[PDB]
């Protein structure tokens, strides 16, 4: 298996989620 | 040189790259002053002693945006996405047309630069009416962009000539990339061409009293979204088809590389209302439909993420790397042509995460027109695209000029790309965080030093970045000039093949490849999608125009 | 070996792509959700509402800023706001807490932003058009309006105030 490529797409997932859910939480906080 | 007689396309490609890097240098001079400003430090007095024609922060910001994000990126895309397919096919581009495209760009640039430099078009790189710049800025710009229609013709011509000579062969990979890319660009470019011909030009000439600002922005963003994919895709063509060789491996999938580009062709253009989430007079259903389709335009980069990572990992393993991290350490980190796109891809992970945020309709109300936005786009264009082009100094330049890169120049290029990358990451932090604190973009906030007390912390990041990037820019100017004005010429370097990667061996999926080669068809699909996504709104707007008077507020 | 690495790469790539698609779909569902809630009131009205920027300060609901705030329902106020070079009228906008506010904002000159700090109100203001957005202030106090669209050399100091009365 491409363990290295998976590690990359994991970091990318976690980044996307932190950004997206972070801003979603700010959105509601300002609602 | 006997090399330019056999490959005259090398000289024209060099002229595009050089002029591109000169615009980047000029436009970038303003970037450190702007990072200091977003760090609440006012260095404009210094800048004005140095460059006495600069009348304001906002004239500096117009120059920075137009030179770096419009001019540099386009010239790079014209160099890469003509010369690479031409070398892959081993065929000469129509040289009359190649030079015509160059001179159109040069002349368009010179004519726009006049009013920009004279403080007659301080309207930024978006030039939103009713702010009213000098007609020459709109005319110079229109001619500059129209240069690219010539490039499109050049590549479609190459492709057709090749296909005539090779009936029933599938399009070679880099040429397939460039064909879908330039056809995507053609459909993308129509928004701005319409906006300029139908409104901005008659208006700045004095022919019509006003322009309707909503129609003007809508037609602007029809083009303003796909133009960023037009910046990005030349860096992607190198990242897929060149970087894996530089990394010491191979491209792990030709079909997955073609599929990403076909997804860009279909999805780059019908999504621009994601720049208009906060605009009146556009129906929220259609905002949602562009939001979904924008989330889909994300998928080709999500696919790129994996295909490219797996290609790098494969290279690292070929070079002996083992573990879960050994593959990374084994890669050629002494080679600036390898390092620069890799670092740019690392910063693209937060860059793309912020883009997916921005795309998410109601989430955009948190960040719109704040510093977050420049935080996102410095990661995408000012970091990945720019670093990839900088890394080309190190394989492409020698190939075009025969001029060797010395050991010392190599190490200097290493330091430049690292400082540039790290400076972009630090500023991304300061700008994303100031944006979440409601600091607006496009603002000389250093002139209102008590307006933003809550942003004190990320402001330190922007100062630091402004200094780190000043140093990276100075070293880059020094480096580029050392390599350009260099003594030695080794003609064999200009005759060496480009460093194009092989593709990993494995079936693969002919029929998918054959299906994606149905370019006429995929193009009509892309174009249908634009009528579907834009038509209904533009019918309504054009049937209810409300033009308004022009202003000069500088 | 190459055959085997290639096979494995394509297999796990298929898996990532499905996951990445799943994730994007969840975001699309989560956005859908916001659009069904009161938070979606800041999305501007889609309907075109054309006005004339050259006479907006002489006739119509923007001509007398002291009359800008109009009760339009039992818990609703419409506020006629002018964003202009380089200021907002009325100044301050005064509204009661916990009421639904329908801001109707236009400009007599260039595009301005209208970004109410601490809220999701963030709307472009186009001359000739009226931007309509809706919000209910839950907390009383002073809210700063920032112009977040470059409107000329006075842009960085173009601010206004909303006072939400207890
Ligand atoms: C080249 C330049 C650009 C790219 C690319 C770009 C991509 C996107 N953008 Fe954007 N953007 C927006 C949405 C997105 C979306 C969804 C994406 C996507 O296409 C992003 C997808 C990409 C990813 C999901 C990341 C994939 C990760 C990769 C491919 C790296 C992998 C790592 C590897 C392989 C390395 C591993 C190796 C090792 C050794 C470990 C939105 C709205 O939805 C706005 C308007 C916001 C507003 O309010 O104004 C916006 C505003 C802008 C502006 C401001 C325009 C202005 O002046 O007003 C620019 C210039 C810009 C540029 C660019 N943007 N963007
Ligand atoms: C030394 C490098 C650079 C630094 C320090 C820098 C810094 C900045 C800063 C701080 C801003 C925000 C200013 C404002 O909102 O008022 C800005 C705007 C911008 N930058 Fe850069 N920049 C640099 C290089 C790049 C390059 C290479 C690109 C493109 C390839 C670029 C494209 C842009 C654009 C498009 C704008 C926005 C212009 C506008 O809003 O009208 N920058 N940059
Ligand atoms: C290789 C390139 C990397 C370059 C890295 C550069 C690091 C910047 C300096 C850090 C030392 C700390 C110096 C700060 C001391 C003075 C602080 C100060 O006075 O603040 C600014 C002034 O107040 C505003 O008007
Ligand atoms: C290899 C590439 C890796 C690239 C990865 C980069 C992505 C960064 C993501 C998140 C940083 C978030 C920092 C921590 C979150 C801050 C939240 C917080 O403290 O919120 C304030 C709250 O209101 C209390 O005052
Ligand atoms: C490495 C260089 C890349 C640059 C990386 C940019 C960093 C921005 C990161 C994450 C955004 C997440 C949003 C943070 C949200 C925290 C606040 C929160 O959780 O909201 C609740 C609070 O009550 C609300 O007012
Ligand atoms: C402004 C218009 C001047 C345009 C000047 C154009 C000069 C064209 C030079 C060029 O690239 O054409 C080669 C030509 O045949 C000669 O050697
Ligand atoms: C080819 C070269 C130049 C085109 C000539 C264009 C010259 C047209 C001048 C019109 C003009 O400047 O009218 C401005 C007026 O004040 C309304 O904004
Ligand atoms: C290069 C592209 C330059 C575009 C300039 C001129 C093209 C033709 C413009 C034709 C002028 C029409 C103006 C007109 O008829 O004005 C209507 C007026 O607004 C109501 O009275
Ligand atoms: C596959 C491509 C996707 C195409 C279709 C995707 C979903 C669009 C459906 C409904 C939008 C409903 C949005 C209405 C939001 C209005 C909110 C409001 O009334 O604001 C105050
Ligand atoms: C505020 C944020 C500022 C900090 C931004 C940092 C973000 C990530 C840092 C570096 C990425 C480089 C990752 C990979 C570096 C690998 C180098 C390596 O493994 O070197 C091998 C050795 O030299 C034999 O070649
Ligand atoms: C605590 C954090 C402090 C903030 C950071 C200050 C910023 C820059 C320091 C300069 C770093 C220059 C990095 C050079 C790395 C380089 O050139 O590496 C070649 C290498 O062997 C692989 O490619
Ligand atoms: C990435 C490399 C490190 C970069 C910056 C160090 C972080 C600096 C944070 C220091 C806060 C300094 C400051 O200005 O403090 C806020 C406020 O003034 C309190 O009273
Ligand atoms: C040797 C190379 C490494 C050296 C690089 C340092 C590494 C990172 C840390 C700090 C730099 C901060 C520099 C910022 C300088 C001035 C900050 C400022 O303007 O202070 C505002 C204050 O909060 C309002 O009173
Ligand atoms: C004329 C516009 C051409 C744009 C259409 C490109 C697709 C096409 O014509 O496909 C057939 C190709 O020429 C066979 O080699
Ligand atoms: C709340 C959300 C949770 C976030 C937490 C991070 C999630 C991990 C991310 C991506 C996994 C993508 C890789 C999918 C692996 C697919 C398996 C596969 O394809 O395996 C086939 C192979 O042949 C076997 O034999
Ligand atoms: C194979 C398993 C598949 C199942 C996995 C599905 C993923 C679940 C994730 C999100 C669901 C959406 C939750 C929608 C509820 C959002 C409510 C919310 O956040 O409320 C905001 C605010 O407080 C009120 O106005
Ligand atoms: C590495 C990246 C680090 C990122 C760190 C992220 C920090 C985000 C902070 C705040 C967002 C929250 C906004 C919440 C809005 C409420 C503001 C408010 O109360 O507004 C004034 C009102 O007038 C009172 O009466
Ligand atoms: Cu009004 Cu900026
Ligand atoms: O434009 O992203
Ligand atoms: Cu876009």
Domains of chain B (ranges, CATH numbers): 1-554 (1.20.210.10)
Q: Which residues contact B106 (CB under 8 A, 6 or more apart)?
A: B19
Q: How far does the CA of residue C114 sit from the closest CA of chain A (Å)?
A: 15
Of B73, B80, B25, B71, the closest CA to residue B381 belongs to: B73
Beta C122-125 vs B210-211: how paired, if at all? Answer: unpaired
Report CB contact under 8 Å: A16, C23.
yes
CB of B158 closer than 8 Å to CB of B182? no
**Whether residue B377 lies in the annotated active site:** yes
Half-sphere exposure of B156 (CA within 13 A, CB side): 16
Nearest CA in chain C to B128: C111
Tokens 């304001």 belong to which residue? Answer: B56
Tell me, in angstroms, the distance from the centre of ligand 15 to residue B310's CA.
Answer: 15
Distances (CA, A) of B139 to A24, B91, B103, B184, B207: 42, 34, 15, 23, 14
Tell me, in angstroms, the distance from the centre of ligand 8 to residue B205's CA.
Answer: 9
Tell me, in angstroms, the distance from the centre of ligand 13 to residue B465's CA.
Answer: 9
Other CB atoms within 10 Å distance of the CB of residue B320: 11
Check the annotation: does B376 bind a ligand: yes
Using CB atoms, which chains have 3+ pairs under 8 A with A?
Answer: B, C
Mutate to test the pocket of ligand 5, among B428, B431, B454, B465 (most ligand atoms within 8 A of CB): B428
CB of B97 closer than 8 Å to CB of B38? no
Residue ranges of alpha helices (H) inside B359-455 are 364-367, 372-377, 386-391, 396-401, 407-436
CB of A23 closer than 8 Å to CB of B350? no
Report CB contact under 8 Å: A3, B312.
no
Tokens 């620069």 belong to which residue? Answer: B340
Helices B254-267 and B226-241, packing angle to 10 deg? 170
The gap from C-alpha B426 to its chain's centroid, in whole angstroms, comes to 21
Report CB contact under 8 Å: C17, B306.
yes
Tell me, in angstroms, the distance from the centre of ligand 1 to residue B261's CA.
Answer: 16
Spell out where C13-147 has E strands. Answer: 69-73, 76-84, 87-89, 93-96, 100-106, 112-116, 122-125, 131-136, 141-146
Given A5, A16, A30, which is nearest B366 (Cβ)?
A30
The gap from C-alpha B197 to its chain's centroid, in whole angstroms, comes to 24
CATH code of the domain occupying C45-166 = 2.60.40.420
Separation between Cα atoms, residue B63 and residue B119, nearest integer Å:
10
DSSP state at residue B502? P
Report CB contact under 8 Å: C132, B131.
no
The gap from C-alpha A30 to its chain's centroid, in whole angstroms, comes to 21
Nearest CA in chain A to B359: A20
Separation between Cα atoms, residue C165 and residue B543, nearest integer Å:
42
Burial bucket for residue C52 (CB in 10 Å: 0-12, 13-18, 19+): middle
Tell me, in angstroms, the distance from the centre of ligand 8 to residue B547's CA.
Answer: 13
**Whether residue B2 lies in the annotated active site:** no
Check the annotation: does B454 bind a ligand: no
- Greatest Cα pair distance, chain C, in angstroms, is 80
CB of B353 closer than 8 Å to CB of B422? no
Q: End-to-end alpha-carbon separation of chain A, Å?
A: 45
Given A1, A6, A31, which is nearest C120 (Cβ)?
A31
Q: Flag whether residue A21 sits within 8 Å of chain B, measured between CB atoms.
A: no
Report CB contact under 8 Å: C12, A16.
no
Give the CA angle between residues B521, B526, B527 to the nearest 5°: 95
Other CB atoms within 10 Å distance of the CB of residue B13: 25
Separation between Cα atoms, residue B385 and residue B398, nearest integer Å:
20
Q: How far does the CA of residue C49 sit from the closest CA of chain B (Å)?
A: 7
CB of C157 closer than 8 Å to CB of C96? no
Separation between Cα atoms, residue C29 and residue C23, nearest integer Å:
10
Q: Which residues contact B405 (CB under 8 A, 6 or more apart)?
A: B393, B394, B397, B398, B413, B483
Of B55, B28, B227, the closest CA to residue B126 belongs to: B227
Separation between Cα atoms, residue B36 and residue B91, nearest integer Å:
48
CB of B264 closer than 8 Å to CB of B240? no
| SS3 of residue B463 by DSSP | helix
Tokens 């793309």 belong to which residue? Answer: B352
Tokens 């490219």 belong to which residue? Answer: B308
Sequence-distant contacts of B282-288: CB under 8 A, at least 24 apart: B282/B214, B282/B218, B282/B537, B282/C44, B282/C46, B283/B537, B283/C46, B283/C47, B284/C35, B284/C43, B284/C44, B284/C46, B285/C46, B286/B533, B286/B536, B286/B537, B286/C46, B287/B361, B287/C43, B288/B361, B288/C31, B288/C35
Q: Determination method here?
A: X-ray
Tokens of B301: 């980069």
Domain ranges of chain C: 1-44, 45-166
Number of domains in chain A: 1
Of B111, B117, B102, the closest CA to residue B137 belongs to: B111
Report CB contact under 8 Å: C122, B292.
no
Determine whether the shortest distance from the Cβ of B125 to ligand 2 is under 6 A.
Answer: yes
Other CB atoms within 10 Å distance of the CB of residue B214: 26
DSSP state at residue C45? P
Ligand that lies nearest to the alpha carbon of residue B39, given by its number in the listed order: 13
Determine whether the shortest distance from the Cβ of B346 to ligand 4 is under 6 A.
Answer: yes
Check the annotation: does B432 bind a ligand: no
CATH code of the domain occupying C1-44 = 1.20.1070.10
Beta bridge partners of B393: none
Q: What is the DSSP secondary-structure string of B274-330?
A: GG-TT-SSS-HHHHHHHHHHHHHHTHHHHHHHHHHHHHHHHHHHHTT--SSSHHHHT
Q: How far does the CA of residue C110 sit from the closest CA of chain A (Å)?
A: 28
Beta bridge partners of C71: C77
Of B416, B397, B420, the closest CA to residue B408 belongs to: B416
| List of chain B residues whose C-beta atoms are within 8 Å of the C-beta of residue A3 | 313, 324
Resolution of the deposited coordinates, in angstroms? 1.8
Q: Tell which atom from ligand 16 comes closest to the C-alpha of A24.
A: 19
The gap from C-alpha B148 to its chain's centroid, in whole angstroms, comes to 14
Mutate to test the pocket of ligand 14, among B162, B520, B522, B525 (most ligand atoms within 8 A of CB): B520
Ligand that lies nearest to the alpha carbon of residue C16, given by its number in the listed order: 15
Helices B336-358 and B299-318, packing angle to 10 deg? 150
Separation between Cα atoms, residue B169 and residue B165, nearest integer Å:
9
State which residues form the domain around A31: 1-31
């Amino acid at each position: 298996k491409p363990k290295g490529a998976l590690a990359v797409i994991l970091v990318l997932t976690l980044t996307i989620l932190v950004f997206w859910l972070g801003v979603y939480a700010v959105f509601f906080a300002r609602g | 040189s006997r090399v330019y007689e056999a490959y005259p396309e090398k000289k024209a490609t060099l002229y595009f790259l050089v002029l591109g890097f000169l615009a980047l240098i000029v436009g970038s001079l303003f970037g450190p002053f702007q990072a200091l400003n977003y760090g609440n430090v006012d260095a404009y007095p210094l800048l004005k002693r140095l460059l006495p024609f600069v009348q304001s922060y906002y004239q500096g910001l117009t120059l920075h945006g137009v030179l770096n994000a419009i001019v540099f990126t386009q010239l790079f895309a014209q160099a890469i996405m003509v010369y690479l397919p031409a070398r892959e096919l081993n065929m000469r581009p129509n040289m009359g047309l190649m030079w015509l495209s160059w001179w159109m760009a040069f002349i368009g640039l010179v004519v726009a630069a006049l009013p920009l430099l004279a403080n007659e078009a301080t309207v930024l790189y978006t030039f939103y009416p009713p702010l009213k710049g000098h007609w020459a800025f709109y005319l110079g710009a229109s001619v500059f962009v129209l240069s690219t229609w010539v490039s499109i013709y050049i590549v479609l011509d190459l492709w057709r000539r090749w296909k005539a000579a090779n009936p029933g062969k599938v399009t070679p990979l880099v040429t397939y990339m460039a064909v879908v890319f330039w056809l995507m660009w053609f459909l993308a470019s129509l928004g701005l061409v319409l906006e300029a011909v139908l409104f901005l030009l008659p208006w700045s000439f004095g022919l019509v009293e006003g322009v309707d600002p909503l129609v003007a922005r809508t037609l602007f963003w029809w083009t303003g979204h796909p133009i960023v994919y037009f910046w990005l895709l030349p860096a992607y063509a190198i990242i897929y088809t060149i970087l894996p060789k530089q990394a010491g491996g191979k491209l792990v999938s030709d079909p997955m590389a073609r599929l990403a580009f076909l997804l860009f062709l279909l999805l780059s253009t019908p999504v621009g209302f994601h720049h208009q989430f906060a605009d009146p007079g556009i129906d929220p259903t259609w905002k949602m439909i562009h939001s979904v389709l924008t989330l889909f335009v994300a998928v080709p980069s999500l696919m790129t993420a994996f295909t490219v990572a797996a290609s790098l990992e494969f290279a690292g393993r070929l070079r002996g790397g083992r573990g879960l991290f050994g593959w990374i350490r084994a890669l050629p980190w002494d080679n600036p042509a390898f390092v620069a796109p890799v670092l740019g891809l690392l910063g693209f992970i937060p860059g793309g995460a912020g883009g997916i945020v921005n795309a998410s309709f109601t989430l955009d109300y948190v960040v719109h027109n704040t510093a977050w936005v420049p935080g996102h786009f410095h990661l995408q264009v000012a970091s990945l695209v720019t670093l990839t082009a900088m890394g080309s100094l190190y394989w492409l330049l020698p190939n075009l000029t025969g001029k060797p890169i010395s050991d010392a120049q190599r190490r200097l290029g290493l330091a430049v790309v690292w400082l540039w990358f790290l400076g972009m990451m630090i500023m991304a932090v300061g700008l994303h965080w100031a944006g979440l604190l409601n600091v607006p973009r496009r603002a000389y906030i250093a002139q209102v030093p008590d307006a933003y007390p809550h942003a004190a912390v990320p402001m330190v990041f922007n100062v630091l970045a402004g200094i780190v990037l000043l140093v990276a820019l100075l070293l880059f100017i020094y480096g580029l000039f050392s390599v350009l004005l260099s003594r030695e010429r080794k003609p064999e370097l200009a005759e060496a093949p480009l460093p194009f990667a092989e593709v990993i061996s494995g079936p693969e999926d002919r029929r998918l490849v054959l299906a994606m080669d149905r370019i006429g068809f995929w193009f009509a699909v892309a174009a249908i999608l634009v009528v579907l996504a834009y038509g209904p709104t533009l019918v309504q707007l054009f049937g209810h125009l409300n033009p308004v008077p022009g202003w000069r507020l500088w | 070996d190459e055959h085997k690495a290639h096979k494995a790469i394509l297999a796990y790539e298929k898996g990532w792509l499905a996951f990445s698609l799943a994730m994007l779909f969840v975001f699309i569902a989560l956005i859908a959700y916001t659009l069904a809630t009161h938070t979606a009131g800041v999305i501007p009205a889609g309907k075109l509402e054309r006005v004339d920027p050259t006479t907006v300060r002489q006739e119509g609901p923007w001509a007398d800023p002291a009359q800008a705030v109009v009760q339009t329902g039992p818990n609703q106020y419409t506020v006629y706001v002018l964003a202009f070079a380089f200021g907002y009228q009325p100044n301050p906008i005064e509204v009661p807490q916990g009421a639904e506010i329908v801001f109707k904002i236009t400009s007599p000159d260039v595009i301005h932003g209208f970004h109410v700090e601490g809220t999701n109100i963030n709307v472009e203001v186009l001359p000739g058009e009226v931007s309509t957005v809706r919000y209910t202030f839950k907390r009383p106090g002073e809210y700063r309006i920032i112009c977040n669209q470059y409107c000329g050399l006075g842009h960085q100091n173009m601010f206004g105030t909303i006072v939400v009365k207890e």
